[PDB]
A paper describes a structure:
The HLAI residues that are polymorphic are mainly those forming the peptide-binding groove, which contains six binding pockets (A to F) that define the size and chemical characteristics of the specific peptide repertoire that can be accommodated by each HLAI molecule. In this study we focus on two [name]-1-specific epitopes and their presentation by 4 different members of the [name]-B7 superfamily, [name]*07:02, [name]*42:01, [name]*42:02 and [name]*81:01. We show that single polymorphisms between different alleles of the [name]-B7 superfamily can induce a conformational switch in peptide conformation that is associated with differential HLAI-specific escape mutation and immune control.
We next analyzed the structures of [name]*07:02, [name]*42:01, [name]*42:02 and [name]*81:01 in complex with the well characterised RM9-Nef epitope. Pro2 and Met9 acted as primary anchor residues and Arg1, Val4 and Arg7 pointed away from the groove for potential TCR interactions. The total number of contacts, buried surface area and surface complementarities were comparable in all four structures. Leu6 was in an identical position within [name]*42:01 and [name]*42:02, but moved by 3 Å in [name]*81:01 and 1.5 Å in [name]*07:02. This polymorphism alters the interactions between RM9-Nef residue Leu6 and the different HLAIs contributing towards its conformational heterogeneity. (D) [name]*81:01 contains a Leu at position 147 compared to Trp in [name]*07:02, [name]*42:01 and [name]*42:02. The four closely-related RM9-Nef peptide-HLAI structures show that similar conformations do not preclude HLAI-specific selection pressures, such as for R71K, that is only observed in the context of [name]*07:02.
Numbering used by the authors:
A (entry chain C): 1 to 9
B (entry chain A): 1 to 277
C (entry chain B): 0 to 99
Write the structure that this text describes.
Amino acid sequence: RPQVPLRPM
Amino acid sequence: GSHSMRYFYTSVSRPGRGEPRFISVGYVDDTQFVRFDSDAASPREEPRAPWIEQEGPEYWDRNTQIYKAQAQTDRESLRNLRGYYNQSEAGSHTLQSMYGCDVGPDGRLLRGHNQYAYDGKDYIALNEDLRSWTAADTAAQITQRKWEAARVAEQDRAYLEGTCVEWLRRYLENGKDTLERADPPKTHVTHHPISDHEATLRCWALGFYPAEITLTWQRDGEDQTQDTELVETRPAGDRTFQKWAAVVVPSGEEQRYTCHVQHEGLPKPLTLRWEPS
Amino acid sequence: MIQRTPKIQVYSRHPAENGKSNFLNCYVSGFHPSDIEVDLLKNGERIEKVEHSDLSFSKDWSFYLLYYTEFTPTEKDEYACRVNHVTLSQPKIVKWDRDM
């Protein structure tokens, strides 16, 4: 299962 | 007996043609098992292997929400990257992401990954320590500073050592009959005169899984690296892979050539020669 | 950006046997950017029922796609794959050779 998004670049 | 889970994300901007498209695919080893596409009519995580179909609605819904949020994050990233490189708002650009874990036969973590490319060039990567970053350039150094302040690496480490490994082990258990089965190559050698002086010997490998394979030609026991044409390994469409290796040989000298095949699924490596019938 | 032109292989799923149903594959790989045009051709005409794999990429970030269709090969019908990409000044046509 995928990881959650964290911070944009 | 090691295994890998990987997610591969592609975001591509398209000024004048809407917001950037986001595509995700997920793999265990060489087997794709999920997809998401923001251009679908009703974007949702969808199954792409039979053994994932048993996951309940909560799985599919939560993962869909993740990918939608990821698309939004990647769109912010794309805008930031264009600015970091002083780029025009008129061009199209690509942000790729890859992440996931490798485990051994014991199910223990071997290593994690979490890395990115911008316009096809490496941009930033989580180091093997799962704690520090490598930045490619002064633009990626901006991202590194931001991600250090936000303690991103800690959260990626937690996923890679926890969720990623645990769910990879679940998938290996549930997909065992395919994911833990190596299908050896079916092999043969063909012969085709090209002139009165020379012929091609082509050594074929078909029907194998996983994709990793080694095909080599030897002349008198010496590997013919410079003289072997070797096609990329290619998918058959039935989960299996194909590959060939060819060498051009003097007519009459065919018995001096042997094709050597190495693959997971073989009890022992094969040595093959042209067998005229 | 980096641009990388596609590699192209055209081949069948199973060894071809005239009059027997099979799949015709066009595998495009090693390209960047990801936008690409791929047609499968029978005697020079576009085949309509063509699907492709979901977009993915290799360790070097280059993209790959499998385009495929059911077909029944014959002695005389000619098949090919036609690819267009920003790296190409005109579309590239690769003929199906049942022995490659």
